[PDB]
Amino acid sequence: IVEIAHPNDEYSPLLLQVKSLKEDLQKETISVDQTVTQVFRLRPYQDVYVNVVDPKDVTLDLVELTFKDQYIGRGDMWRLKKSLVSTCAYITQKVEFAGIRAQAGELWVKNEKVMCGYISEDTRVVFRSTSAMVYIFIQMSCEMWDFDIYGDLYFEKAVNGFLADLFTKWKEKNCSHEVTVVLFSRTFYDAKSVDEFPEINRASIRQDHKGRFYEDFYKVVVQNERREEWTSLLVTIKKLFIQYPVLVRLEQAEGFPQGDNSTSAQGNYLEAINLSFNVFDKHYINRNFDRTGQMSVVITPGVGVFEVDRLLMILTKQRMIDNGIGVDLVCMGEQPLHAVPLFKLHNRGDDYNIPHWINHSFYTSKSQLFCNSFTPRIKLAGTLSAPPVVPGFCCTVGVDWKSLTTPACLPLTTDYFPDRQGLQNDYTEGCYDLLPEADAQQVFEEFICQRLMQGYQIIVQPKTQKPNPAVPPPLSSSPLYSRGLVSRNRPEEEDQYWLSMGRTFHKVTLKDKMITVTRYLPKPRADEDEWQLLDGFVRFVEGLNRIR
Amino acid sequence: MPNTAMKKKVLLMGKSGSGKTSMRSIIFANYIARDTRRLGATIDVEHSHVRFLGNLVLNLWDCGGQDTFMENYFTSQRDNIFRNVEVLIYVFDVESRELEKDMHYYQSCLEAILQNSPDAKIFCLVHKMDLVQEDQRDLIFKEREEDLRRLSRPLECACFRTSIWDETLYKAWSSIVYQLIPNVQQLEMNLRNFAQIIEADEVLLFERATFLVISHYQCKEQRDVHRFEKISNIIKQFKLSCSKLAASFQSMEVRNSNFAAFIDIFTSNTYVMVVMSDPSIPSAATLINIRNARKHFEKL
Amino acid sequence: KPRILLMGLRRSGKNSIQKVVFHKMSPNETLFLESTNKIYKDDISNSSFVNFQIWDFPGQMDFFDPTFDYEMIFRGTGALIYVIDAQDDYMEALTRLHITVSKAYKVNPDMNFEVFIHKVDGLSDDHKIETQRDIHQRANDDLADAGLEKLHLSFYLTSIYDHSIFEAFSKVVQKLIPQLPTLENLLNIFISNSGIEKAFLFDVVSKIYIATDSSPVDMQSYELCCDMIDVVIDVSCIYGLKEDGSGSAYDKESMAIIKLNNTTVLYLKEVTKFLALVCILREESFERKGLIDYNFHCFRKAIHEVF
Numbered sequence A: 001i002v003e004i005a006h007p008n009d010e011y012s013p014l015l016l017q018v019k020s021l022k023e024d025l026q027k028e029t030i031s032v033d034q035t036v037t038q039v040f041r042l043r044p045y046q047d048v049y050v051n052v053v054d055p056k057d058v059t060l061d062l063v064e065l066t067f068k069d070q071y072i073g074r075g076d077m078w079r080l081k082k083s084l085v086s087t088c089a090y091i092t093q094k095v096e097f098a099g100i101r102a103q104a105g106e107l108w109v110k111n112e113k114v115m116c117g118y119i120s121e122d123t124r125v126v127f128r129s130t131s132a133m134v135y136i137f138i139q140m141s142c143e144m145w146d147f148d149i150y151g152d153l154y155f156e157k158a159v160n161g162f163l164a165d166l167f168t169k170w171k172e173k174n175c176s177h178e179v180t181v182v183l184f185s186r187t188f189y190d191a192k193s194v195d196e197f198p199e200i201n202r203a204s205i206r207q208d209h210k211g212r213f214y215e216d217f218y219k220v221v222v223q224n225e226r227r228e229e230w231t232s233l234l235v236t237i238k239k240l241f242i243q244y245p246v247l248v249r250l251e252q253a254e255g256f257p258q259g260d261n262s263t264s265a266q267g268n269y270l271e272a273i274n275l276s277f278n279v280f281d282k283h284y285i286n287r288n289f290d291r292t293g294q295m296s297v298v299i300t301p302g303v304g305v306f307e308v309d310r311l312l313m314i315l316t317k318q319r320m321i322d323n324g325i326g327v328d329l330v331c332m333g334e335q336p337l338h339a340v341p342l343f344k345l346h347n348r349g350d351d352y353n354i355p356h357w358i359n360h361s362f363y364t365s366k367s368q369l370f371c372n373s374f375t376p377r378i379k380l381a382g383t384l385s386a387p388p389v390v391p392g393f394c395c396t397v398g399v400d401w402k403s404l405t406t407p408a409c410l411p412l413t414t415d416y417f418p419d420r421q422g423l424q425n426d427y428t429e430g431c432y433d434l435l436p437e438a439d440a441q442q443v444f445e446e447f448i449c450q451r452l453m454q455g456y457q458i459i460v461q462p463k464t465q466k467p468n469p470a471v472p473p474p475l476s477s478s479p480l481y482s483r484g485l486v487s488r489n490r491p492e493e494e495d496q497y498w499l500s501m502g503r504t505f506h507k508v509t510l511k512d513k514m515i516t517v518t519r520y521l522p523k524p525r526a527d528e529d530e531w532q533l534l535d536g537f538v539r540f541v542e543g544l545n546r547i548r
Numbered sequence B: 001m002p003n004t005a006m007k008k009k010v011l012l013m014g015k016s017g018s019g020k021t022s023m024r025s026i027i028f029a030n031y032i033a034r035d036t037r038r039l040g041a042t043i044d045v046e047h048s049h050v051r052f053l054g055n056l057v058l059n060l061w062d063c064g065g066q067d068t069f070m071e072n073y074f075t076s077q078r079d080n081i082f083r084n085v086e087v088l089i090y091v092f093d094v095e096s097r098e099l100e101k102d103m104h105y106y107q108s109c110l111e112a113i114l115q116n117s118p119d120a121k122i123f124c125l126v127h128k129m130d131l132v133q134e135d136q137r138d139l140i141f142k143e144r145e146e147d148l149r150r151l152s153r154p155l156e157c158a159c160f161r162t163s164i165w166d167e168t169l170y171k172a173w174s175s176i177v178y179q180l181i182p183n184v185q186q187l188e189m190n191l192r193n194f195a196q197i198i199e200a201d202e203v204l205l206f207e208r209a210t211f212l213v214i215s216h217y218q219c220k221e222q223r224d225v226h227r228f229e230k231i232s233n234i235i236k237q238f239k240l241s242c243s244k245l246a247a248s249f250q251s252m253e254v255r256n257s258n259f260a261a262f263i264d265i266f267t268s269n270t271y272v273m274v275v276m277s278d279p280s281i282p283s284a285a286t287l288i289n290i291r292n293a294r295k296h297f298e299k300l
Numbered sequence C: 001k002p003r004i005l006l007m008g009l010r011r012s013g014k015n016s017i018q019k020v021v022f023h024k025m026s027p028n029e030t031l032f033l034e035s036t037n038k039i040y041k042d043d044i045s046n047s048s049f050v051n052f053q054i055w056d057f058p059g060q061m062d063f064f065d066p067t068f069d070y071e072m073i074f075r076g077t078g079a080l081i082y083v084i085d086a087q088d089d090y091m092e093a094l095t096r097l098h099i100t101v102s103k104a105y106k107v108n109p110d111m112n113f114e115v116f117i118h119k120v121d122g123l124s125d126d127h128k129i130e131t132q133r134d135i136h137q138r139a140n141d142d143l144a145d146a147g148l149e150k151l152h153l154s155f156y157l158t159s160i161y162d163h164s165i166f167e168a169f170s171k172v173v174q175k176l177i178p179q180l181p182t183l184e185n186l187l188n189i190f191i192s193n194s195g196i197e198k199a200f201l202f203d204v205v206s207k208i209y210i211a212t213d214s215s216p217v218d219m220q221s222y223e224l225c226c227d228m229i230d231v232v233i234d235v236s237c238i239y240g241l242k243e244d245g246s247g248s249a250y251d252k253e254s255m256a257i258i259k260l261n262n263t264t265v266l267y268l269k270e271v272t273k274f275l276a277l278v279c280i281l282r283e284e285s286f287e288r289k290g291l292i293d294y295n296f297h298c299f300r301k302a303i304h305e306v307f
């Protein structure tokens, strides 16, 4: 448990490592040659009288760990944190455990990044990947073909500027993802033609009657394919931008067409994020062994306003309760004079809402002028009301490149109030004694008994894309369709659940259930082995822990 | 203690509504009759292992009682559920009205346990008699006795009465345990030798963690049936009270006018109490006779 | 000063839980039908423990007609129970508590009125504070102007069956008339060679019990001593006194010790007639006669010798 530091004269960084009770300095060590060329060049021979021997309880309050090229369920992240309780670290070390490997990065104490340091049981570690699975939804409207200030198309700003910057940073940080690039848009008055009927939809408003025919189109570009040397997608997206208006206007039904409706008036935005969730719920089907993190990024030329039905917004709140994966970025620029992600309700004062689950970021272009105006203008020829959006102050939002190049996995420890009484009128305890055997047959008995993998509670999966007509535009996919029915259910009325799973020797796991947060408490295979495995299997699906 | 670790099997079934999993949850998790209002709905099947004075361990199955779950018991995977069953407990509500469907399920369950268990046994248990007046309690229990003795014709059953707010529950599961126990005659002989050479009023020996009446011997037969039930209920109430004090019990002494009762640990999971037919003796007799008893039971 | 009488809020609906309270305590209060009277400070209170009858609980429709009979019942020491319930029938009854109390303090010298806050189960940690602030707000202009009106605003912890009414009922019998602070500090002198944490003086099975120096501190030990006396009395009741001697004949030579893990012992010893003592004891090994039993014997002799 002894800690040894060793600079030389006026090394502005330092170095330190561990041993067990060094006092007389008879014994030294060589274990690493790399750290010389990793920090500072000198050849320290046996005793130059600079090696400080000190306890020096100095912690490293947040440490980041990056993964590459593998697949790690969050129980293995829990095993790495359990093995990383009481050790030391430095920048760019390759931490290993049981064929699992991570690279250390950006280790901070409270304002400043440290070259080295010590980790003991109360600092927090956060896991990030450079090998994630990422979807890019480009929303198209009639504002793509509209100019802005500085002189550009918003499409050209978005694709050229932002995607060139993102792919250069993907080359620089040496990451390797699996992408989709999906274009999506709407048209109005595409009522009917020869057998194009289950493709349309029909929008309406209750309080003032308004009902129109509309139609949603998705055109995908490269579906599930990793490759280095990007920017060829930029050429294909330019080809599809020029081919796009005929490709969307003159298809399946031909009434009088109105293409690519405005984002600040209509939009298929919330349905697009809900369909990304409809992809990500079935992650356990065909499992790549080369990806860990999950990411869905929507690029919009919108302002931040969306006119959205009530049921879809409440449903996607209840579905991002499970697996938070959604990121929004705006290549329109022009950060408006209000709380910028906002929803005007479209329910079957104009009822506002502001989300705090979404991660929005703007993209300013690269030029320097005098007074960047925050307004458009177009000349025509001729009881509560408790959220308004205007008294919320908002200076500037960046791009947050670090949450777009290295995606962050979901945390481990969150603090929340206990399971008292009142609403959650249901607890159930199962105390399962375990007989060790030397003949694989012991975990699954407790497993199929005590949960049946949320056999109690439901999975709120109410969106089902049942139909999709496709179109014979070319050899990628091209589904152009209607979303189908949305069979929403409310949450569990007048009762949540909580559970008490006991090991009859000395052990308890107290499960809460609104999001699966746990409290583990202690008092052939061993007892602690089965206990740790069961906590890992409750950890795999929804795995928050209470702490203190 | 010779640890012949067998593995017994016991099912608990009946209709939903009244007292299916509540009684199990108050007899193996240290609850009260008031806090069992919060268990609520179970699911299809949930089971547990409970260890019990060492060697014996119970696979205690708790089966639900909806229509689809009973149908998915009978006309489905039945051969897996009703195989290697030793003890069945079948729960009867009093207040429930659909008696025809209850006895229909009972007939189907008897025929299924006959065609999947030759030497198991069925205890049917009419609980929740806390709502009916006592003369009508006698009438209803005798009618259940005679009607269930008729309809349980090709194989016998044992029908007991109980409620949650009293101690007949502890008597009924004391009976279940004493039937389910492996050994009888050696413990009876040590019981009888101890009681007849240290001249006690009555001696009583119990499991520690749940305190069900394992064995007893008396020579003053003036307490009818309700002594065991009452003393078990009140000292387990006292253990529940001491549970919130982070401390174990393991030892107590009381004496009175014509009364001398003592409680202590005997073995790894056994309590003893005794009343000693000579109230004017201090703890020297309890000392020399816990010596006299732990020389023998720690040869067992 | 309890001439306590049961007045809830409705005759046919509150008497359910009031009769649960009655059959919770009064099967060991009802010994005082032909026991004694006229000599003690608690004998009139025990005769009031006997007379737990009922009345019309909103009494402001007839402020004159019943009152006549219990005019006599409200002369001389002075108490009456009152309920603060959960539902919205609290503010109008809380307004007319002055109607219930005006005749009382005008007909009798110095009284204490037992307003219990009762069965509001479902209180949060701040909501119980703001509902305390409710009675602090609307019980000012009846208290700050009266004079010799003594009020006891007690707060039961609002569950179904908790032990948290009768430590406050122990406080009101402490507030009866303590003629024994000499006995209090002399009893503190008697715990000088003792397991000095708790020495509770008890009387017979009736569930009112006095206490000194150790009630609220660091644990509800009044809960464990109530469990202690309930366990030993229910062992002795029909399992111990059915064969020889009637159950009414107490005459108990019953001592009881309870050991537990850190060498901690609970200790009940009692004279046969009416007096009892539970003096708990810490990590101490009494295998002698020169420390505990001699001096404890001397002052159980003294405590039987006092009155």
Ligand SMILES: Nc1nc2c(ncn2[C@@H]2O[C@H](COP(=O)(O)OP(=O)(O)NP(=O)(O)O)[C@@H](O)[C@H]2O)c(=O)[nH]1
Pocket: B015, B016, B017, B018, B019, B020, B021, B022, B023, B036, B037, B038, B039, B040, B041, B042, B043, B063, B064, B065, B066, B127, B128, B129, B130, B163, B164, B165
């Ligand atoms: N007062 C009182 N309540 C009782 C009695 N018996 C059962 N109950 C109530 O009945 C409720 C139901 O518990 P229980 O029947 O064990 O649940 P369950 O039938 O296993 N759930 P499921 O229908 O999914 O199988 C309990 O909350 C309990 O309060 C009784 O004798 N007295």
